[PDB]
Amino acid sequence: EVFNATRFASVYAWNRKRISNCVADYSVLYNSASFSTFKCYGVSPTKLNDLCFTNVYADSFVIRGDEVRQIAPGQTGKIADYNYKLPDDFTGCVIAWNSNNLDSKVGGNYNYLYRLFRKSNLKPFERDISTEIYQAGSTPCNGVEGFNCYFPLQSYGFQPTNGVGYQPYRVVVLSFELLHAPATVCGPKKSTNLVKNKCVNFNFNGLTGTGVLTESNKKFLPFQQFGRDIADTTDAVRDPQ
Amino acid sequence: SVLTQPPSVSGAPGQRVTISCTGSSSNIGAGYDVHWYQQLPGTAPKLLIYGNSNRPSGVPDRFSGSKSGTSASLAITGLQAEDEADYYCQSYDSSLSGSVFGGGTKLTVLGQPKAAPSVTLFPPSSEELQANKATLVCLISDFYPGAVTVAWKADSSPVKAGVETTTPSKQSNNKYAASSYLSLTPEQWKSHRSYSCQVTHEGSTVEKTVAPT
Amino acid sequence: VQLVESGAEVKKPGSSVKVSCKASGGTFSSYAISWVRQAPGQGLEWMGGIIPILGIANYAQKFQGRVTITADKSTSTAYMELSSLRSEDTAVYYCARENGYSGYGAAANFDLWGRGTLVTVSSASTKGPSVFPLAPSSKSTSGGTAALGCLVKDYFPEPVTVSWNSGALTSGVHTFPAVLQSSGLYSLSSVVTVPSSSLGTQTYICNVNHKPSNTKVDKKVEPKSCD
Amino acid sequence: QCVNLTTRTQLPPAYTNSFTRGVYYPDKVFRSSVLHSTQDLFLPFFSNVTWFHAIHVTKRFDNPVLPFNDGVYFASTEKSNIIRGWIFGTTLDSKTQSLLIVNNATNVVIKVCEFQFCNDPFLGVYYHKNNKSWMESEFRVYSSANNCTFEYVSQPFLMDLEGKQGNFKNLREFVFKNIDGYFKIYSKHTPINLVRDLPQGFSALEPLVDLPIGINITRFQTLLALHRSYLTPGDSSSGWTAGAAAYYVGYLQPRTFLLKYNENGTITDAVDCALDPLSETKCTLKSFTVEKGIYQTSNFRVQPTESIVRFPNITNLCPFG
Ligand SMILES: *[C@@H]1O[C@H](CO)[C@@H](O)[C@H](O)[C@H]1NC(C)=O
Ligand SMILES: *[C@@H]1O[C@H](CO)[C@@H](O)[C@H](O)[C@H]1NC(C)=O
Ligand SMILES: *[C@@H]1O[C@H](CO)[C@@H](O)[C@H](O)[C@H]1NC(C)=O
Predict the structure, then answer these.
(1) B140 found inside a domain
(2) Most buried one in B24, B41, B213, D218, CB count within 10 A?
(3) How many angstroms from the chain centroid is the CA of residue A156?
(4) Do both B49 and B127 map to the same domain?
(5) Best of D313, D314, D315, D317 for a ligand 3 pocket test (most atoms within 8 Å of beta carbon)
(6) What are the structural domain ranges in chain C?
């Protein structure tokens, strides 16, 4: 529902999702063949499912096609410094794709907003929802569209008949947290092909034994996982598949 | 919806009374600030505390707000004569794409001692019979508190049709009063022998009957 | 500042409602304005918020495309339009103001609220009210105090007031509230307490004022002769 | 919220004897045709166990705060499902991480939080006049709760709310252990036709779900439910009814037990090694049958009860006074 929804949010107030007490697989997010750009700093894009962390912070907002290069640590501009700042120790993983047939319509879709003016810089990972008129001059104006007072929040120009570098791009960033806590959301070895009657090596959560897997004729009680024998040897392990 | 709250909480006038708001990990536990409001029955709600760290102008400093992980807490010290309202917990939810309020807790004292009621039964007048309807009224007055169970009978069976009870309002001498109607037709009004209104109040049952003929 | 809203309003189940939001002074053309509703029985919902500077709508996913909120810059007022009403629209709306800030939370707060607009809808629409006299009997009066009054039946809508002799009677008056019926209608009562020695000299007249219907019925009260 | 009770005439608890009770699965592996011994918390046979009554016909209602040791044995010959749940904690003043494992009529609620436990939390079943069924309405277990982390919902279980005064038809055993902060629950229902003096039958106990709470538990207390019929005025001061129930509270001792495993893999017999010298011979030899001969089980060491240390005879006082 974060990826596929009826509508999205803006950049001054974006959607914040926390992934806790869950398990996921990042293999279906790589073989989709539908994303435009894919950058993943701090960790390799194909070896991030084995190493897993504490928490996953995912933020979702919309951005134009010419500003997708601004979501990176170590540059200055207009959007990456007034709406969402990227720190130096940024191990996030950004995913962007084009869905111009849903977030735009004929006549002018101006439902999403952005902030243009700001007094000073802001700390990264901080949301700014201030709707105050940024004063440019030295005199107070008391909320009027007069001189030396301009509104920081301005509208977009999304049109579905545009080119490539100015279309509404759905951009999401997946950041990880590293604290003194055990692994919660994690990627565990998935599920390989089941083979039998060969000299194989398996690791069923309690042991690493090398041998064969013959079909037994005894059914176990539905509360055990392993099985010993007379000679005190674990030679019967229930397959969790 | 996504925010649940206890239905009622008890407290003492002089001790510390605390309340909690529990939701999900995407609206309150994600990092968004919480806002507490007071819903007084008879005026518009105002702002009490925003962000659980600042104090607006016009609010006392007895309210304390804190966020312990995924849940927010509100603690007060001393129960005055203005805390007969409801407390709601409001947080910005991303799954609903907007702000959503909580359930609401009631914290009002009963303060309703017992008294002796007095009923009056009035039969319909002559001008009301030609309107193809019959409104049997049942007025109760000078009682405390306003919790009266109204039942009707026709000397042979209880009436379970057309029964209505109104909410009692406060009088000028700190009493309550209410009335009960019975929507009937004049065709069967003269066929029965009598009509009566039976009520109870802490076991006290007062009966009054009239006769159309 | 202060925000002034309209009073009570009733409509039909399937028609459109037209309420407004007035602002006293300024600080209305610079901050966002939202609409918060409240119904007895459930919590408080949030329809959407409208920015008056750019004129951009921002609703929620729980409300479909049936309500539209507009703004005006010439007189600094806001209007609310909602058609195809249902049976659960009996609630009250509030004209609220939003003041954003900076921080890690950055949540929308409602520091300034409105007055309130009671918008109730049901069947049994406005018709002609019917009032009936009530007279005490010889059995209902045992001492030197008699009970009598006037009952109002089949009246709509609220609120309706009852006066005794154009406000000349103050001590001993009691106005009873309304009650929902099976047909969606209301009924009230109003009785007084007068000595028995004034029943043959001074007359008691009830006058009902129904400003939404513009009906003023002036009826006579007389004691019964058979009892 | 909770209310206080009124002082009345109660009945003192009695002491009965157990007969081959308190045997469960000591591990999560499969064993067959092997006689293996382990060192876990079990119940010694033919030991003195406490007995508490719950019948009405009088007015027996005792629910004391018993100290929770390393492994307990809670056996109940339940008939009409009177006992609802159990609570845990140390001081019960919203200071530690208390436990609440209750079995309601809708679902099992296992909520480890900081509820405000009163002096005597009990469930209330009120009898409706128009509806001829026993429904629970008085939910008086705790007052409130501020913030907690663990919350788990178990499988739904249907219960009967109607209480009678007849003989029991079922028997339920519960084992609560706490090793390395992990909570263990061993439960299995077994039909039996008896009132008291439990038979010498054998029945294993299988676990359902392990709860990694990671806290220490030193006290525990059971919860009882009462009925509110038309014979009682409906006040919880002196007039109530509780049906008929009998629960046993036993403390598991760290004693080694020899288990028997058949071809099916279930527990058939249990042999102790610190209760009887006949049972000590069978587990030490790892055989359930003993022939004629002399064997050696253990040793006999006499522990010293006194310890004297006398370095001088008399301390000669040099002149300092
Ligand atoms: C794993 O899933 C399969 C199919 O979804 C099921 O047959 C099997 O019982 C599951 N194993 C478990 C729940 O341990
Ligand atoms: C135990 O299992 C065996 C075969 O696995 C079966 O023959 C026997 O009846 C079972 N015992 C029971 C179900 O009590
Ligand atoms: C200790 O003192 C006692 C009595 O004063 C004496 O009989 C004994 O010999 C002494 N032991 C010595 C000096 O080792």
Answers:
(1) yes
(2) B24
(3) 24
(4) no
(5) D313
(6) 2-121, 130-221
Best of B47, B55, B94, B99 to mutate (most C CBs within 10 Å, chain C): B99
Cα–Cα nearest to D208, from D110, D306, D80, D309: D110
Q: Both B81 and B126 in a single domain? A: no
Q: Which tokens hold the place of A52?
A: 């897993």
> Is B90 in the same domain as B125?
no
Resolution (A): 4.2
Residues belonging to chain C: 227
3-class SS letters over A77-132: CCCCCCCCCCCCCCCCEEEEEECCCCCCCCCCECCCEEECCCCCCCCCCCEECCCC
| Domain presence at residue B1 | no
How far is residue B174 from each of residues B85, B115, B117, B139, measured CA to CA in Å? 21, 11, 13, 17
- Other Cβ atoms less than 10 A from the Cβ of A107: the count is 6
Nearest to B192 by CA among B213, B162, B207: B213
Contact D169, D193 (CB under 8 A): yes
Burial B92-110 (b: 16+ CB within 10 A, else e): bbbbbbbbbbbbbbebeee
Neighbouring residues of D119: CB distance < 8 A, sequence distance ≥ 6: D2, D4
Looking at the CA of residue D312, tell me the nearest atom of ligand 3: 1
Q: Hey, which bits of D12-80 come out as E strands?
A: 14-17, 29-30, 37-42, 48-53, 66-67, 72-76
The rounded distance, in Å, linking the Cα atoms of B170 and C158 is: 20
Which residue do the tokens 């001088």 mark? D312
Residue B2 included in any domain: no
Elucidation method: cryo-EM
The matching CATH number, chosen from 3.30.420.40, 2.60.40.10, 2.60.120.620, 3.40.50.2300, for C2-121 is: 2.60.40.10
C49: nearest CA partner in chain A: A111
CB contact under 8 A, C151 and B50: no
- CATH number for C130-221 (one of 2.60.40.10, 3.90.580.10, 3.40.50.300, 2.30.30.280): it is 2.60.40.10
Which two tokens mark D280?
A: 């000590």
CA distance D29 to C29: 73
Instruction: Judge residue D278's burial from the number of C-beta atoms within 10 Å of its C-beta, 0-12 exposed, 13-18 middle, 19 or more buried.
Output: exposed
Cα–chain-centroid distance for residue C114?
16
Most C-contacting residue of B32, B53, B140, B166 (CB-CB within 10 A), to test interface: B166
Residues B195 and B152 in one domain: yes
How is residue A227 written in tokens? 């099985």
State the ligand closest to the CA atom of D266. 2
Q: Are residues B128 and B61 in the same domain?
A: no
Annotate C135-170 with b (16+ C-beta within 10 A) or e (fewer). Answer: bbeeebeeeeebbbbbbbbbbbbeebebbbeeeeee
- Ligand 2 atom with least separation from CA of D264: 1
Is omega for the bond preceding A140 within 30 degrees of 0, making it cis?
no
> Is residue B123 located within the same domain as residue B147?
yes
Please say whether the beta carbons of B12 and B18 come within 8 A. no
Residue boundaries of the structural domains of chain D:
14-298
Kindly state the tokens that stand for C60: 């929620």
Burial A182-220 (b: 16+ CB within 10 A, else e): eebbebeeeeeeeeeeeeeeeeeeeeeeeeeeeeeeeeb
Ligand 1 center to A208 CA (angstroms):
22
Q: What is the CATH number of domain D14-298?
A: 2.60.120.960
Residue D13 backbone phi and psi in degrees, to 5: -75, 150
Inter-residue contact A94 to A40 (CB < 8 Å): yes
Q: Which residue has the tokens 């439910």?
A: D225
Q: How many CB atoms lie within 10 A of CB D123?
A: 22
Could you tell me if B12 and B104 lie in one domain?
yes
CATH number of the domain where residue B122 is located: 2.60.40.10
